[PDB]
């Protein structure tokens, strides 16, 4: 397989060790800065719930998407870098991100 960032991180983070996940996004910002999004702009989640929040600013993100010829155990990904607003669903106390709803 290829040694691109996506192939490597998806494996290291236990996302493709036992299957090939179609898509995943990695955020390159401090953990605390991402957690801070839970008190930023309140927006509706795709499912209709209102516990989602959109970051005020764009953040550095890497999008990982399976190629058309990807097949377990040899998962293969296309790596795309971008700067976009993230939308996260938050829950609990402390009020932190538990799901990524999207990226604008």
């Amino acid at each position: 397989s290829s040694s691109n960032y996506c192939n490597q991180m998806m494996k290291s983070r236990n996302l493709t060790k036992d299957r090939c996940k179609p898509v995943n996004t990695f955020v390159h910002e401090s953990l605390a800065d991402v957690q801070a999004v839970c008190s930023q702009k309140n927006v509706a989640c795709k499912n209709g719930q209102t516990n989602c929040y959109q970051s005020y600013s764009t953040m550095s993100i890497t999008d990982c998407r399976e190629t058309g010829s990807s097949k377990y155990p040899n998962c293969a990904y296309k790596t795309t870098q971008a700067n976009k607003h993230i939308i996260v669903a938050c829950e609990g106390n402390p009020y932190v991100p538990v799901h990524f709803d999207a990226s604008v």
Binding site: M9, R13, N14, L15, N24, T25, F26, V27, H28, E29, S30, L31, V34, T62, V88, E91, G92, V96, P97, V98, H99, F100
Partner: peptide
């Protein structure tokens, strides 16, 4: 086990 918050960090954060 792994909490929802922990899972989100493992799957999406690369500080």
């Amino acid at each position: 086990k792994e909490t929802a918050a922990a899972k989100a960090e493992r799957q999406h954060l690369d500080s």
